[PDB]
Design a protein around this nucleic acid. Structure first.
Lengths: 400, 409, 413, 400
DNA sequence: TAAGTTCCTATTC
DNA sequence: TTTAAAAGAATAGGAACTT
DNA sequence: TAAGTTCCTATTC
DNA sequence: TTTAAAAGAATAGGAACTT
DNA sequence: TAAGTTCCTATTCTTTAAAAGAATAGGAACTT
DNA sequence: TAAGTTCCTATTCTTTAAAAGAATAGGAACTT
């Protein structure tokens, strides 16, 4: 990819390659300065700070779409998300004195007559059909859990391979359960899996994601759930069909010191996943272009919590901005696991008289040792995922 | 109304009518550009976004009160709630180059300040009202006693059965739902449904979309033990008022709703009435709560019973415990008033702060069991006959239920 | 006072009197425009909003000290706490076109090395920070907060010239300590707001309300039984039987009298004599320092007491330091606060609960004994000057507690 | 030291010496204005307020590293932590009109950004992880404490250094204080203070703390193989009062408990005798280990409420107005804290109580036997440390 | 087969 | 999706001596 | 006869 | 001492008619 | 020697403002 | 009569932006 090449190219070389384009003013050469120009405009406006893959990608597109130049008057202009265009224009000139640069703001700073004619148009005959469907999804009959199962099911046969089937369901259920984004699941450090105690379910599986959108680390969980949908089961299926992925570098920094060497899922999994979700459209919402896809899980849990009147948890669970890395309260999992119910009147979690009590089953599992069969059931993750974890999951699975 | 005419006038025409005023500079013409100017300043600062009736009304008043101009120097100024006055001034000029505009922040001149002070000095903000409400509450009478007394103050003083019916309905409705006037008025009569409630069997639910914070909420009506029965007042309301055509409330032009539950002006006569029959001192205070009393009453009721956790949900308050973004684009489902809320307000149950439970009052009549007796009852479609004006508008399932409940008593 | 006259003068008249000063340009006339000018600069910069007595007093002084003018060039300048000097200058001119005004910031941009140096050079060779030094000592040395409180309280016992002043000083001091309030917090109490309020640790305590506080955030002022030689109820008793209700002083230009308290608890000038007294009978060094805390001592003491005991969470609430329903917002003090300050209990850091001292007398039970016999409206007889002002329920309670204290057979039947 | 000389030099003289450097523009003279310039820039930006040793040291280094000048154009520039460079530049000029000064923010141009990036291209989290490891492994806090304490037992070259290291370490742990918290103790403030659990404990006072918020330092009898009183005894009988080093350009205090340079020697020692891996890490905690240990101890025992008080962490409950203006008495460390750390008791998280460990020796009763000489055992501190204290310690020791 | 990927561009958060 | 950069004041470390 | 007051000015919050 | 100012969108009120 | 010292430099922690407004403390001449 | 209406004006609630950055969704053209 372009970004990968950028990261491979030495700084001095980049500035070199950029300058060369202007010695023998060629349309073929100046029109390919987009990547380089992006890098430069950033390095300038941020004094050397590294640039993230996504951000670079975005800006590079913006520059490409706006780049225009006059080889005769030695002038060149383009758009860039910045407000100190001057400082940037100047710095650019210093690198290529002969030329005159013009940075055009990406954001508009709105003529009446247009606004009017546009209004006049509307008068005669928001455009968020996406929000309309999302309301329906939740507004009609089915409960959140019913919708979850149905979506989860839509991949069951439509998938071409067991791996993809396994991945889609795992990813979807994972996103819902943690109210996380695709990346929150994908960037998990497989080596961070641990067994953590929870006074309601005994123990739950916890892993860590560092490379999140807002760069605020958060935990991702997996736990036993009462009913036809059991996260542990899908985690099991996931593990026995997929393998660790080398952490893709996503920023120009050269930092090779401390960092995760692996990641839980493949970066491109999202494309196929969305493409799948799009086709097997279990609900209308998924037919809408640019409508939520992999995100859906996020929106679902966010709604679930708001509906249950537990918005206090929303922030913690969904990892947002509020006023060690903050952990999810014990009762959250109690609820989502379905072994308990939230009582509005007293505000406590009440377990369902259903026979199986998660706590007692963990104890039965915790007891009988001498069964490192976990490392035998999950060969590809052996040596990667804590054995204590692999053994627990393995047991739980066999033990049922 | 002016706003209605604004909505009826085609955009190009508005800009037309505005420009004309400046070709033959007349005082009679420039002094009437307020409405148009309001619309324009908005459209400009919001890039075509529609403007809401109330907001337009407000701004239009502000412009009217501040509009001043010099026909000779071709200059014109006025106040407008904005901080990017320049952008606005410029855009205005482009439409009428000859003139120079000056937008003054709504954030004055001494002689005015003075005369105004001189005025105040001679004649003998909301603090008094809050104190009076606390009084109203801190004296023998319970929330329900106060509710009944107010409800009664209209019983005789009203000039017509309709007005009497409307006032009581509105008041009780506002209290019961902890809603504002508008929360009751903008209900979509076509959204009435029967919804189950584990404490009362079923309750009537309707929907309001056009709320102050634009966050939709539900409005309810349910059987209540005691002298005051919401269902009864709903019955009286329905048999004396008729569906109201939904007033247009924004310049836009479409998620329709042809009707609304009450008349927009009902609030004026209602407050005027509440003011005169002043059942309590609080109502004598100028600018003191009027139609808002209902809301304050229930808010107090819940707090006093120590259930402030519900207050937010019932009063439909923007919830701040969840990220802004978590709200704006990730939440897609109206929060639900918890079942027990109605149990309490219905008076068929009581709240035990210690056991955190709803203790049914041994009153003979059991809400749940009576609904079953009513639900069994079939064929009797006397609902559409009892509420002719709402027939075809309000779900027949609802009209039949109410009708039965009423007759069945 | 000048401020009172300002409030009595009709707006149009003020502007009148001000303008007149500039028609027959006289030094005797222009030099007396300070009050008027203060009022005007405020009304202008605040669009008619009223001005508070203290603020007016302050600004008027600042203007008086800086006012200067040229009758020939028809120019006049002065300092005023503002940053939009221009808007102000203009508005002034419009009122008197002939003249040119110049508002000078009270708080300029703000020095020069050589000065800084010579100043340092001065110091190298060789009362506000000395204030903080003494306050630390006061608390740092032996004595406990309660010991210091008693000692100060006593310093007035024999140095006062009248029983009333003695009574007032001790009441005020103890009141300020107990509520961690300022002089004004005690002075502006609405005598008509006294009420009996329940407290799970002491049975009941006396509560009153102050609205006119510095930060305009209302707060409650309390009085309660305390175990030991210092009993707030006793000093309240002495206070009430020697002082009378004070008509509420008007403290803002508003004409509004429509609704407001007609009485205030203490006299505005009490603070002068009180500080003067505290200054002389200087029970401790701290009080000798010029501009050092005087009536404010109470506030510092309690703040320190709470910090020392590690209960800073209460500090804000009790001291009313700034940080739904249709309600006059006033946050109250948690029940346990009074438990502590009353001395009938102790704070246990390990569990965070209040533990009563096995001392025989338990306050709750005594309130019950008092609550039982009523009908003895002996309160209105003991506090004649407050009768009809302070709730009878309150006067009767205090009265009983007092009698039921010194002893008497009828009060013990 | 330079700073000491600064404090010894009269203000007028400093400004004198500074000005002289610019009359006969000499590289040898202008290049030595760093100290003086530091002082001045401070005095200017703070209107005469004194400057602290550490702060002066830091700024002086920054100026030295950036100072550059042109004797011909009579210009001089340097970096300084400030944002009102102009005001400063001006003031400087007024003192030496002929010259033009340029203050550069300490906290651009492409070629620099580039070369800097080119540099990086070619070439904190670990320490925290290592501490967690150190903690999350069999050995209890007290076991770790003893082991570290022992690592000096033989590796030390003198009895004094051995004595000092162990004392300092145990002191830091016990009080959850920094090096300075122990070093700046006023030896004349030692007292006997009552404790409802241990009878009495030794209390001293530190005024010159980092946050300038005074705090108390304690020493008390502890059950087990590690007894603070014993190490205090060893300390006292091998070291002696240190003259309080002046730490600001300006409130006497004739002595301090330890030597300012003790920390270097101590860290160097801790580094070599590395009892644990953590100590091998460059820039990893050294003398700071004690605080971290206690901080962890309290958190682990679930008593974080105490942490703030014991560690003297700036309180954020009471407002700044409250804290600044109206607070004049050091928050008292709760009695039970010492009960715990002394090991004569245990904390019951459920009953919220101190459960005395049936150990035979009762701390309270032994104090009484003692309460029912010292100046001869601690000659160097005689007349300095309260006799009441020296006698108590002396007894306790002999009575052992 | 295309569902799956691959590597940008377009949109949304 | 988010929203505190920096001054101010310690605690490590480096290098060359010292006991 | 000085502690108390009155009504500003100076300082501090 | 305190420290979010203001745009945006309801709910009261005033005045002159209607019934 | 090499741990232990000096005396800076390099790193890693902790705390942060300014001024309009509105009290409280003090100065003098007067009251009692 | 005045309560009840109109149609603004006056008051009193309520919630906030904008944009640089960083992901997720979609378009075309290859792969198992």
């Amino acid at each position: 990819s372009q970004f990968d090449i950028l990261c491979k190219t030495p700084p001095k070389v980049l500035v070199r390659q950029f300058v060369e384009r202007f010695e023998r003013p060629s349309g073929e050469k100046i029109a390919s300065c987009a990547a380089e120009l992006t890098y430069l405009c950033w390095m300038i406006t941020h004094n050397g700070t590294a640039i993230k893959r996504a951000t670079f990608m975005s800006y590079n597109t913006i520059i490409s779409n706006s780049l225009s130049f006059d080889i005769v008057n030695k002038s060149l202009q383009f758009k860039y998300k910045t407000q100190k265009a001057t400082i940037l224009e100047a710095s650019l000139k210093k690198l290529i004195p002969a030329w005159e640069f013009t940075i055009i703001p990406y954001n508009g700073q709105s003529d009446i007559t247009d606004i009017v004619s546009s209004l006049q148009l509307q008068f005669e005959s928001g455009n968020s059909h996406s929000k309309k469907m999302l309301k329906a999804l939740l507004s009609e009959g089915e409960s959140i859990w019913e919708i979850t199962e149905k979506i989860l099911n839509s991949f069951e046969y439509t998938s071409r391979f067991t791996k993809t089937k396994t991945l889609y369901q795992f990813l979807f259920l994972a996103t819902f359960i943690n109210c996380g984004r695709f990346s929150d699941i994908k960037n998990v450090d497989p080596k961070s899996f641990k067994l953590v105690q929870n006074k309601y379910l005994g123990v739950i599986i916890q892993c860590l994601v560092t490379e999140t959108k807002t760069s605020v680390s958060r935990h991702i969980y997996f736990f036993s759930a009462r009913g036809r949908i059991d996260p542990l089961v899908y985690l099991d299926e996931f593990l026995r069909n997929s393998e660790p992925v080398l952490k893709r570098v996503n920023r120009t920094g050269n930092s090779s010191s401390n960092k995760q060497e692996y990641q839980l899922l493949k970066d491109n999994l999202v494309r196929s996943y969305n493409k799948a979700l799009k086709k097997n459209a279990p609900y209308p919402i998924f037919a809408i272009k640019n409508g939520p896809k992999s995100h859906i899980g996020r929106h679902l849990m966010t709604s679930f919590l708001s509906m249950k009147g537990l918005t206090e948890l929303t922030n913690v669970v969904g990892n947002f901005s509020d006023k060690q890395i903050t952990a999810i309260p014990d009762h959250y999992f109690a609820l989502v696991s379905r072994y308990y119910a939230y009582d509005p009147i007293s505000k406590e979690m009440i377990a369902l008289k259903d026979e199986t009590n998660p706590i007692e089953e963990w104890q039965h599992i915790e007891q009988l040792k001498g069964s490192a069969e976990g490392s035998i059931r999950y060969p590809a993750w052996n040596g990667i995922i804590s054995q204590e974890v692999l053994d627990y999951l393995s047991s739980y699975i066999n033990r049922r």
